[PDB]
Amino acid sequence: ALTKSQTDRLEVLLNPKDEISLNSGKPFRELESELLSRRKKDLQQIYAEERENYLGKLEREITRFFVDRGFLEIKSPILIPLEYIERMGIDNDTELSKQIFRVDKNFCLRPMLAPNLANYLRKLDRALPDPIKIFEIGPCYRKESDGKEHLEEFTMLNFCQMGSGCTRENLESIITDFLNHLGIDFKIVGDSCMVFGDTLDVMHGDLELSSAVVGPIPLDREWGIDKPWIGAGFGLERLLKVKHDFKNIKRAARSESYYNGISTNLHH
Amino acid sequence: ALTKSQTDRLEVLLNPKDEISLNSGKPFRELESELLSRRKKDLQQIYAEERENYLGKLEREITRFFVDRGFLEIKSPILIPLEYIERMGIDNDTELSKQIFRVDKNFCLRPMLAPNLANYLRKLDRALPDPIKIFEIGPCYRKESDGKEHLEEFTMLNFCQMGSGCTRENLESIITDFLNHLGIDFKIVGDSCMVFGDTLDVMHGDLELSSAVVGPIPLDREWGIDKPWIGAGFGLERLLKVKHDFKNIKRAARSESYYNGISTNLHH
Ligand SMILES: Nc1ncnc2c1ncn2[C@@H]1O[C@H](COP(=O)(O)OP(=O)(O)NP(=O)(O)O)[C@@H](O)[C@H]1O
Ligand SMILES: Nc1ncnc2c1ncn2[C@@H]1O[C@H](COP(=O)(O)OP(=O)(O)NP(=O)(O)O)[C@@H](O)[C@H]1O
Ligand SMILES: [Mg+2]
Ligand SMILES: [Mg+2]
Ligand SMILES: [Mg+2]
Ligand SMILES: [Mg+2]
């Protein structure tokens, strides 16, 4: 019989690669020591072999996928004006606004990539041929209640296309090719949100990997966009969670407590 | 004769690839139109060819360099406790503390990677063989006066080694191999700072690319580090500035105003 604290300690040392079946009759210390040795070995293997961080590696794989398929790689600011949020229709008397990490009086950590990419679509329309295809991967921030599927600091992919080819069929096709490339099964369910209207939610079981939108939408007017567009936002830690069978998304996050899903707290 | 506003407009449309020699007798509008066409062509070329963001690409090239040479890739939080900063010796009655982007009462956007990597060195010492070699690339944040060599939102590389091989000669050798790989000439000048003590500053002309440290140092005690170590921090936008001959570092930054050093504001 273990205390909750003991159970918690073993849980954090366990990994999806471990056998989780029976309760052992071994004392807590012996169980802890066994899992510590396993996790040290896992880190030694990573160090000897690839030495890549799984979140970094996924970001690189996703980057290559989109660049090879004609999408321009964007790197825009993480710190953005609060005004961008207001202009997405998220005023400060909305429940959604409560999730915003404010920085000084007028700025915030971006909770999404959409405003930045809207600006890029509008600007690039003056230079690029049809269709315009762009994407960004990077940090986004939301205040969240503690949960196994949510992080306050996470990583978003957003791709979008503007001009011709902006149909629901093409959007679903891009999503399908993308998740097929990552080896992730999914289904599409129609849903909606107040910022974008109707959406296509990309689900793995009960876990939302992405929400996708077929534009145009009325909100486009506030961003100087007047062409059809399609786009989708994906959480990289969620993609990693599914790929590696992590139960808690914290295993997939930027962290000092987990590295590639392995506890970094390997003292007794 | 141009107004300052007209001069500013042409400056932002000019690129290092442009010929800057004489004053043209053409009217401002004609000059603007010519540079607009050039910058559109530049974006069209990027879109047709590589489609990579120069800052992203540099980050990938640097990642590959360090991973191939036995350094573990770290991805740690960008949002960190203010306490980490205090424990680097930067209390709130210091001038340096004025540069910190605070987030809520107890957190900040990291101005440096050192505390996070110190934690990783201490933790990884329980698992990895000698020497322990790690690195991280990612966003860092400092309040700065407006300058051509400083950004508020920038990107740092920090590498470090711990255990054997932690000599000044090896540190300089790693730096030399690294900048030789990037095709950047530099010199080393001894200097110091109050956080780390004496440093080796990696200079390209009068521009600081990096500061490097040969440990151990007294501060190690506050971080649970008791082995020799060496390390260096580099600004990626500064490396890009030198590589591409950008006069203003804003051309190298995460931005909605510049893409690969090219103005995104291509209206008349
Ligand atoms: N706090 C978070 N932590 C991790 N990933 C997130 C978080 N919020 C959103 N995402 C991811 O970003 C994608 C697009 O964001 P968005 O459509 O705003 O999410 P959402 O509707 O708030 N999803 P959810 O919080 O699961 O109900 C989501 O499908 C997730 O994959
Ligand atoms: N505000 C900034 N913008 C861009 N790069 C920066 C900035 N601050 C630091 N760096 C880079 O990060 C490296 C390591 O940081 P650090 O040693 O703290 O810089 P520093 O001593 O403040 N340099 P400086 O501000 O040029 O006098 C520097 O050598 C730069 O290449
Ligand atoms: Mg949510
Ligand atoms: Mg959604
Ligand atoms: Mg400085
Ligand atoms: Mg320095």
Curated annotation (Swiss-Prot), chains A, B:
Predominant subcellular localization, coarse grouping: cytoplasm
EC number: 6.1.1.26
A GO-annotated cellular component: cytoplasm
Lineage: Archaea, Methanobacteriati, Methanobacteriota, Stenosarchaea group, Methanomicrobia
Protein name per Swiss-Prot or TrEMBL: Pyrrolysine--tRNA ligase
One MF term in the entry's GO annotations: pyrrolysyl-tRNA synthetase activity
Keywords assigned: Aminoacyl-tRNA synthetase, ATP-binding, Cytoplasm, Ligase, Nucleotide-binding, Protein biosynthesis
Catalysed reactions, as listed in the record: tRNA(Pyl) + L-pyrrolysine + ATP = L-pyrrolysyl-tRNA(Pyl) + AMP + diphosphate
Entry keyword Cytoplasm: yes
Species in which this protein is naturally found: Methanosarcina mazei (strain ATCC BAA-159 / DSM 3647 / Goe1 / Go1 / JCM 11833 / OCM 88)
Residues of the full protein shown: 189 to 454 of 454
Protein family membership: Belongs to the class-II aminoacyl-tRNA synthetase family.
Function statement: Catalyzes the attachment of pyrrolysine to tRNA(Pyl). Pyrrolysine is a lysine derivative encoded by the termination codon UAG.
Localization terms from the record: Cytoplasm
GO biological process: tRNA aminoacylation for protein translation
